[PDB]
Design a protein around this ligand. Structure first.
Ligand SMILES: Nc1nonc1C(=O)c1ccccc1
Length: 468
């Protein structure tokens, strides 16, 4: 008999799995929401704002109405290379944002030391991708890397139709802190990472007024062989592609149809993405420069380190947020957490979710969320930033690991507003002027210098319908 080869690997379940980390794909968790689990790992936070700041100029007439198509193409070219490095070195890309990606090497406590070495090497090789690369006249196509290590908590929250996850805890906070100490081309280790690492491998230096350290060099001992060392480390990497599947970047590429599993995984993925996955929408429909309203919600907790308290709080907030968003076809694009604040990047006006009065509704939705979440047990402060303008939407990443992501100055603005104007609902000038709501529903705010925003324009507090 003949032996035709090539296992078919393009099933819907596999396509869905591209949008998710191994943490979720192979997780098999209880149905309770919230669900929490705990482990140890090494984290890598790669700041990619250097080249995703490209977005503004892709709206220029120069790109002849193909700005979004060109932007996703060039971004994915670069980001794909980063993802491949992460994957080949054994890491799990947890999420993408417009300005960063976060990767995890989950391992038993005893192997943290050796895995940090692996992750440093990976980091250095990532920087190596960009050492001599630019466009037009600007080589700011470079990245900044923070690494952290230690205890990590995982939270899964959602309802019967939608799920979201976060990793949280000090190591997660640490990786964020480390990355924003990094200059271009730097690899910065959190204090704990530095404490736990193989100091014989690496030369570091101090970071002024900081216990974090900068990696100057990976200088391995005389008879060290990284490839053999890596192979030893793979013993502790549950899903590293191997044997007959050593040619694949992800084990998830080998997933077979399993309706129960697919039911669980699809809950993490937006319906419009599922439509594309199911070949019921053109594969390029979701790459666009689109006017939207961003409602960025930040929840700060009474006790920031107590995962057991924050989980139920986020779940309670989520249940309300999703109900309010349904009422106006708003969608949660991302959920993020560091600094102890949990933030929901909500979007009004995504593809196929048009509808006029987007501004009035965004503001009313923001206020509703604010009022409700402010009453949630353990939520100390709610802050909401509302900004409206043209943003890039598209699936960003590698073929095998990518996510629908929104990128733009207005996303950054809403994000900065919620942090620099805590405890209130704020909006930009577009939103204020477009709502046409009475002017006394607002308060004109002092201008604040916000990191990453040049010329925010006049900003406003949405005070609401009444003085009280
Ligand atoms: N915490 C988290 N758990 O999953 N993702 C995050 C997160 O904050 C993040 C932020 C920016 C980019 C990528 C991830």
């Amino acid at each position: 008999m003949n032996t035709p080869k090539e296992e078919f690997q393009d099933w819907p379940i596999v396509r869905i799995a591209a949008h998710l980390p191994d943490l979720i794909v192979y997780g098999h968790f209880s149905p309770e929401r919230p669900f929490m689990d705990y482990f140890d790992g090494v984290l890598m936070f790669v700041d990619i704002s250097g080249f995703t700041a490209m977005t503004e100029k892709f709206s220029s007439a120069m790109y002849m109405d193909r700005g979004a198509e060109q932007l996703v193409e060039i971004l994915n070219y670069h980001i794909s290379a980063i993802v491949e490095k992460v994957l080949i070195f054994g890491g799990d890309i947890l999420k993408f944002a417009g300005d960063a990606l976060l990767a995890l090497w989950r391992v038993e406590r005893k192997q943290l030391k050796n895995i940090i070495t692996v992750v440093i090497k990976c980091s250095l090789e990532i920087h190596g991708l960009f050492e001599t690369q630019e466009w037009e006249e600007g080589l700011d196509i470079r990245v900044k890397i923070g690494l952290a290590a230690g205890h990590i908590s995982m939270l899964v929250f959602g309802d019967e139709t939608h799920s979201h996850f976060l990793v949280i805890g000090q190591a997660v906070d640490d990786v964020r802190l480390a990355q924003n100490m990094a200059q271009m081309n730097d690899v910065i280790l959190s204090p704990n990472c530095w404490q736990l690492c193989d100091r014989s491998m690496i030369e570091i230096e101090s970071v002024p007024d900081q216990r974090a350290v900068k990696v100057n060099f990976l200088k391995p001992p005389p008879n060290f062989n990284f490839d053999e060392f890596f192979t030893k480390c793979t013993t502790f990497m549950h899903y590293y592609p191997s044997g007959e599947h050593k040619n694949l970047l992800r084990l998830a590429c080998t997933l077979k149809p399993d309706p129960e599993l697919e039911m669980s995984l699809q809950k993490y993925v937006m319906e419009s993405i599922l439509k594309q996955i199911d070949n019921k929408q053109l594969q390029g429909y979701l790459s666009e420069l689109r006017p939207v309203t961003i409602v960025f919600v930040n929840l700060m907790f009474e006790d920031q380190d107590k995962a057991e308290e924050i989980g139920p709080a986020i779940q309670d907030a989520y249940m309300h947020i999703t109900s309010v968003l349904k009422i106006f076809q708003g969608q949660i694009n991302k959920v993020f957490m560091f600094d102890k604040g949990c933030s929901f990047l909500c979007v009004f006006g995504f593809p196929g979710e048009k509808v006029p009065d987007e501004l009035t509704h965004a503001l009313e939705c923001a206020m509703d969320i604010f009022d409700f979440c402010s009453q949630v047990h353990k939520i100390q402060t709610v802050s909401i930033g509302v900004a409206s303008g043209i943003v890039f939407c598209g699936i960003v990443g590698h073929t095998v690991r990518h996510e629908y992501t929104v990128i733009g100055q207005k996303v950054n603005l809403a994000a900065r507003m919620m942090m620099y104007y805590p405890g209130i609902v704020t909006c930009d000038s577009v939103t204020y002027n477009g709502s046409n709501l009475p002017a006394y529903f607002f308060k004109e705010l002092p201008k604040k210098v916000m990191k990453g925003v040049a010329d925010s324009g006049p900003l406003y507090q949405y005070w609401g319908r009444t003085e009280k």
